[PDB]
Amino acid sequence: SEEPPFDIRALRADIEDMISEKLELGPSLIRLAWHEAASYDCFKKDGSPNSASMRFKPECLYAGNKGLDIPRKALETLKKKYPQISYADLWVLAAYVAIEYMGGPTIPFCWGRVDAKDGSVCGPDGRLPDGSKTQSHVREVFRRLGFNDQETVALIGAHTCGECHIEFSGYHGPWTHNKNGFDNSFFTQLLDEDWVLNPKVEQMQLMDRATTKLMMLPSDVCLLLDPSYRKYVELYAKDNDRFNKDFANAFKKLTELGTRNLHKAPA
Ligand code: HEM
Ligand SMILES: [Ca+2]
Ligand SMILES: [K+]
């Protein structure tokens, strides 16, 4: 529709380059964008999602955002090179490129997000979801964000890529045997393995009986235990195209929560 004031083409290319020079950045950029949107409360209408408010204290110090300085710092180099882009746009755009680069769907980008100017707009701590908890908590968090059960399950399928780091969350390991590819293999893994207790990680997590090299969180396996969430796990495990499409729509929605006057980018 409308040309952004920054060179989007060149920028897309710089972000693919940066990811290619450091592949484990792909998943952290997705998590960065998700956590900047995850402060929203659709009932209270607060929390400054999608405003790059995680640049500021105290949100940058919340336990759940630990390690997200890495992708923020990496993107600083690009903000410098393309000054017309807001950080908030940049953070969203880099997640979309990451998803695509790793084999995921191409999500239509909208631009024009305004950056928070100070940390007084940041939402409270305790809005990010807790991996040690299960379906009650999960549904409560995602209701509060504006998502239904179908959207919830689709979004959590992003765990198909990346991994847990002891230093950041206290959990350990990848969910899938290809942490650098974005497909429906998180649901597939969830359903096809026998998940057994990992007796050597201090924060409770499961491991696959077959190899013991994969992991799931309590919040992940709660998607099997809940009868509504399990319908959708099954839907995505048996239909990768459907997963691509629903993930695309839900993530776009996630990254457009609490925004206004966006413009559709070209491609
Ligand atoms: C129930 C909701 C969620 C919980 C409890 C949760 C929990 C976690 C935890 C504990 C980590 C590990 C962080 C680390 O140690 O580095 C993580 C990583 C990640 N999560 Fe989530 N997550 C949730 C939902 C989501 C959603 C909705 C998205 C995306 C749409 C997402 C995408 C990711 C990605 C990409 C990583 C990888 C980060 C990396 O490799 O550096 N997660 N998640
Ligand atoms: Ca925020
Ligand atoms: K994967």
Coordinates of C-alpha atoms and ligand atoms in Angstrom, one line a residue:
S1 CA 0.0 0.0 0.0
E2 CA 2.4 2.7 1.3
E3 CA 6.1 3.2 1.2
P4 CA 7.8 3.5 4.6
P5 CA 10.2 6.3 5.2
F6 CA 13.1 3.8 5.8
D7 CA 14.6 1.5 3.1
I8 CA 12.6 -1.6 4.0
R9 CA 14.2 -3.7 1.2
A10 CA 17.8 -3.0 2.3
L11 CA 16.7 -3.3 5.9
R12 CA 15.1 -6.8 5.3
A13 CA 18.4 -7.8 3.8
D14 CA 20.5 -6.5 6.7
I15 CA 18.3 -8.4 9.1
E16 CA 18.7 -11.7 7.1
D17 CA 22.4 -11.0 7.0
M18 CA 22.6 -10.5 10.8
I19 CA 20.6 -13.6 11.4
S20 CA 22.8 -15.6 9.1
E21 CA 26.0 -14.4 10.9
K22 CA 24.4 -15.6 14.1
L23 CA 21.7 -18.1 13.7
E24 CA 20.5 -18.4 17.3
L25 CA 19.4 -14.7 17.0
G26 CA 16.4 -15.9 14.8
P27 CA 14.5 -17.3 17.7
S28 CA 15.5 -14.5 20.2
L29 CA 14.1 -11.8 17.9
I30 CA 10.7 -13.6 17.8
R31 CA 10.8 -13.8 21.6
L32 CA 11.8 -10.2 21.9
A33 CA 8.8 -9.1 19.8
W34 CA 6.4 -11.4 21.6
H35 CA 7.5 -10.1 25.0
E36 CA 7.1 -6.5 23.9
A37 CA 3.5 -7.2 23.0
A38 CA 2.8 -9.5 26.0
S39 CA 2.3 -6.8 28.6
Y40 CA -1.1 -5.8 27.2
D41 CA -4.3 -6.2 29.2
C42 CA -7.3 -5.9 26.9
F43 CA -9.7 -5.6 29.8
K44 CA -7.8 -2.8 31.5
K45 CA -6.4 -1.4 28.2
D46 CA -3.0 -0.8 29.6
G47 CA 0.5 -2.1 29.4
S48 CA 2.0 -0.3 26.3
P49 CA 2.4 -3.3 23.9
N50 CA 4.4 -2.9 20.7
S51 CA 5.9 0.3 21.8
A52 CA 9.5 -0.9 22.5
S53 CA 8.9 -0.1 26.1
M54 CA 11.2 -2.9 27.2
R55 CA 14.1 -0.4 26.4
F56 CA 13.3 1.1 29.8
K57 CA 13.6 0.1 33.5
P58 CA 11.8 -1.5 35.1
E59 CA 10.4 -3.7 32.3
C60 CA 13.9 -4.6 30.9
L61 CA 14.7 -6.0 34.4
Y62 CA 11.6 -8.3 34.7
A63 CA 12.7 -11.9 35.3
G64 CA 10.8 -13.0 32.2
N65 CA 12.7 -10.7 29.9
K66 CA 16.1 -12.0 31.0
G67 CA 18.5 -12.3 28.1
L68 CA 16.5 -10.1 25.7
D69 CA 19.2 -7.4 25.9
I70 CA 21.0 -9.6 23.2
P71 CA 18.6 -9.1 20.4
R72 CA 17.9 -5.5 21.5
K73 CA 21.6 -4.7 21.3
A74 CA 22.0 -6.5 18.0
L75 CA 19.2 -4.4 16.5
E76 CA 20.7 -1.1 17.8
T77 CA 23.2 -1.4 15.0
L78 CA 20.4 -1.4 12.5
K79 CA 18.5 1.5 14.1
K80 CA 21.6 3.5 13.7
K81 CA 21.9 2.5 10.0
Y82 CA 18.2 3.2 9.3
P83 CA 17.2 6.1 11.7
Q84 CA 13.7 6.7 10.3
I85 CA 12.4 3.4 11.7
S86 CA 10.9 3.3 15.2
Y87 CA 12.4 0.7 17.5
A88 CA 9.0 -0.8 17.8
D89 CA 8.6 -1.2 14.0
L90 CA 12.1 -2.6 13.9
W91 CA 11.5 -5.1 16.6
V92 CA 8.3 -6.4 14.9
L93 CA 9.9 -6.4 11.5
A94 CA 12.9 -8.4 12.6
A95 CA 10.7 -11.1 14.1
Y96 CA 8.8 -11.4 10.8
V97 CA 12.0 -11.7 8.8
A98 CA 13.2 -14.3 11.3
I99 CA 10.1 -16.4 11.0
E100 CA 10.3 -16.3 7.2
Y101 CA 14.1 -16.9 7.1
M102 CA 13.7 -20.0 9.2
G103 CA 11.1 -21.5 6.8
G104 CA 8.0 -20.0 8.4
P105 CA 5.2 -18.0 6.8
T106 CA 5.6 -14.6 5.3
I107 CA 3.5 -12.3 7.4
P108 CA 2.3 -9.0 5.9
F109 CA 4.1 -6.1 7.7
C110 CA 2.4 -2.9 8.9
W111 CA 4.5 0.0 9.8
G112 CA 4.1 3.3 11.8
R113 CA 4.4 2.3 15.5
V114 CA 5.4 5.0 17.9
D115 CA 8.0 4.4 20.6
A116 CA 7.4 4.9 24.2
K117 CA 9.3 7.9 25.4
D118 CA 9.9 6.8 29.0
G119 CA 9.3 4.0 31.4
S120 CA 6.1 5.4 33.0
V121 CA 4.0 3.6 30.3
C122 CA 5.5 0.2 31.0
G123 CA 3.1 -2.4 32.4
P124 CA 3.5 -4.1 35.7
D125 CA 5.6 -7.1 36.3
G126 CA 3.6 -10.5 36.4
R127 CA 2.0 -10.2 33.0
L128 CA 4.5 -12.5 31.2
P129 CA 3.5 -16.2 31.4
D130 CA 5.1 -18.6 33.8
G131 CA 6.5 -21.9 32.2
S132 CA 6.1 -23.7 35.6
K133 CA 2.3 -23.2 35.5
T134 CA -0.3 -25.0 33.5
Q135 CA -3.6 -24.4 31.6
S136 CA -5.5 -22.3 34.1
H137 CA -2.7 -19.8 34.1
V138 CA -2.1 -20.1 30.3
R139 CA -5.8 -19.4 29.5
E140 CA -5.9 -16.5 32.0
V141 CA -2.8 -14.9 30.4
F142 CA -4.0 -15.3 26.8
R143 CA -7.6 -14.2 27.6
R144 CA -6.1 -11.1 29.2
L145 CA -4.3 -10.5 25.9
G146 CA -7.3 -10.8 23.6
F147 CA -6.7 -14.4 22.2
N148 CA -9.0 -17.4 22.1
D149 CA -7.9 -21.0 22.6
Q150 CA -7.1 -21.6 18.9
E151 CA -4.9 -18.5 18.8
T152 CA -3.2 -19.4 22.0
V153 CA -2.1 -22.8 20.8
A154 CA -1.0 -21.5 17.4
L155 CA 1.3 -18.9 19.0
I156 CA 2.9 -21.2 21.5
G157 CA 3.9 -23.4 18.5
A158 CA 6.8 -20.9 18.0
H159 CA 8.7 -23.1 20.4
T160 CA 9.3 -25.1 17.3
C161 CA 12.4 -22.9 17.1
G162 CA 15.1 -21.8 19.6
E163 CA 15.9 -23.2 23.0
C164 CA 15.8 -22.6 26.8
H165 CA 19.0 -21.3 28.4
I166 CA 19.8 -22.0 32.1
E167 CA 21.3 -18.5 32.5
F168 CA 18.0 -16.9 31.3
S169 CA 14.9 -18.8 32.3
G170 CA 16.6 -21.6 34.4
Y171 CA 15.2 -24.2 31.9
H172 CA 17.4 -26.1 29.5
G173 CA 17.3 -27.3 25.9
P174 CA 15.5 -27.2 22.5
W175 CA 11.9 -28.4 22.0
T176 CA 12.6 -29.9 18.6
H177 CA 15.4 -31.6 16.7
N178 CA 15.6 -28.6 14.4
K179 CA 15.6 -25.5 16.6
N180 CA 16.5 -23.4 13.5
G181 CA 13.4 -24.4 11.4
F182 CA 9.9 -22.9 11.8
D183 CA 7.2 -25.5 11.2
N184 CA 4.6 -27.5 13.1
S185 CA 7.1 -29.8 14.7
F186 CA 6.5 -28.5 18.2
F187 CA 3.0 -30.0 18.1
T188 CA 4.3 -33.1 16.5
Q189 CA 7.0 -33.6 19.2
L190 CA 4.4 -32.9 21.9
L191 CA 2.1 -35.6 20.7
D192 CA 4.6 -38.2 19.3
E193 CA 7.1 -38.5 22.2
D194 CA 6.7 -39.9 25.7
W195 CA 7.5 -37.0 27.9
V196 CA 9.3 -38.2 31.1
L197 CA 10.6 -36.2 34.0
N198 CA 14.1 -34.7 33.5
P199 CA 15.6 -35.6 36.9
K200 CA 18.7 -33.3 36.5
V201 CA 17.2 -29.8 35.8
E202 CA 16.3 -28.1 39.1
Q203 CA 13.3 -26.3 37.5
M204 CA 10.8 -29.0 36.5
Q205 CA 10.8 -29.9 32.9
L206 CA 10.2 -33.0 30.8
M207 CA 12.5 -34.8 28.2
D208 CA 11.8 -37.2 25.4
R209 CA 12.2 -40.8 26.4
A210 CA 13.6 -41.7 22.9
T211 CA 16.7 -39.4 22.9
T212 CA 16.4 -37.3 26.1
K213 CA 17.8 -34.3 24.1
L214 CA 14.5 -32.5 23.8
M215 CA 12.5 -30.7 26.4
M216 CA 9.0 -29.5 27.2
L217 CA 7.8 -27.1 29.9
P218 CA 4.8 -27.7 32.2
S219 CA 3.2 -24.9 30.2
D220 CA 3.8 -26.7 26.9
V221 CA 2.4 -30.1 28.1
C222 CA -0.6 -28.5 29.6
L223 CA -1.7 -28.1 25.9
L224 CA -2.2 -31.9 25.9
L225 CA -3.9 -32.0 29.2
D226 CA -6.5 -29.4 28.5
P227 CA -9.3 -30.8 26.2
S228 CA -9.8 -27.6 24.4
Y229 CA -6.1 -26.9 23.8
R230 CA -5.4 -30.5 22.8
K231 CA -7.9 -30.2 19.9
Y232 CA -5.7 -27.5 18.4
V233 CA -2.4 -29.3 19.1
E234 CA -3.8 -32.2 17.0
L235 CA -5.0 -29.8 14.3
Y236 CA -1.6 -28.3 13.9
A237 CA 0.4 -31.5 14.1
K238 CA -1.6 -33.0 11.3
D239 CA -1.7 -29.9 9.1
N240 CA 1.4 -27.8 8.7
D241 CA -0.2 -25.4 6.2
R242 CA -3.0 -24.6 8.6
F243 CA -0.4 -24.0 11.3
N244 CA 1.5 -21.6 9.0
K245 CA -1.7 -19.6 8.2
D246 CA -3.0 -19.4 11.8
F247 CA 0.4 -18.6 13.3
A248 CA 0.7 -15.8 10.7
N249 CA -2.7 -14.3 11.6
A250 CA -2.2 -14.6 15.4
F251 CA 1.3 -13.2 15.4
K252 CA 0.4 -10.3 13.3
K253 CA -2.5 -9.7 15.6
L254 CA -0.1 -10.0 18.6
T255 CA 2.2 -7.4 17.2
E256 CA -0.7 -5.0 16.4
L257 CA -2.2 -5.0 19.8
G258 CA -2.7 -1.5 21.1
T259 CA -1.6 0.2 17.9
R260 CA -3.2 2.8 15.6
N261 CA -2.6 4.4 12.2
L262 CA -0.4 1.7 10.7
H263 CA 0.3 1.5 7.0
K264 CA 0.6 -1.7 5.0
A265 CA 4.2 -2.2 3.7
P266 CA 4.8 -3.2 0.0
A267 CA 7.0 -6.2 -1.0
Ligands
HEM1 C1 2.6 -20.0 27.7 C2 3.4 -19.1 27.1 C3 4.8 -19.1 27.1 C4 5.7 -19.5 28.0 C5 5.5 -19.9 29.4 C6 7.0 -19.5 27.4 C7 8.2 -19.8 28.0 C8 9.4 -19.7 27.4 C9 10.7 -19.9 28.0 C10 10.9 -20.3 29.4 C11 11.6 -19.7 27.1 C12 13.1 -19.9 27.3 C13 13.8 -18.5 27.5 C14 15.4 -18.7 27.6 O1 15.8 -19.4 28.6 O2 16.2 -18.2 26.8 C15 11.0 -19.4 25.9 C16 11.7 -19.2 24.7 C17 11.0 -18.9 23.5 N1 9.7 -18.6 23.4 FE1 8.3 -18.8 24.7 N2 6.8 -19.1 26.1 C18 5.6 -18.9 25.9 C19 5.0 -18.4 24.8 C20 5.6 -18.0 23.6 C21 5.0 -17.4 22.5 C22 3.6 -16.9 22.4 C23 6.0 -17.2 21.6 C24 5.9 -16.6 20.3 C25 4.9 -16.2 19.6 C26 7.1 -17.8 22.2 C27 8.4 -17.9 21.6 C28 9.5 -18.3 22.2 C29 10.8 -18.3 21.4 C30 11.0 -18.0 19.9 C31 11.7 -18.7 22.3 C32 13.2 -18.9 22.0 C33 14.2 -17.8 22.5 C34 15.7 -18.2 22.1 O3 16.0 -19.3 21.5 O4 16.6 -17.4 22.4 N3 6.9 -18.3 23.4 N4 9.7 -19.4 26.1
CA2 CA 5.5 -3.2 26.3
K3 K 11.8 -26.5 14.6

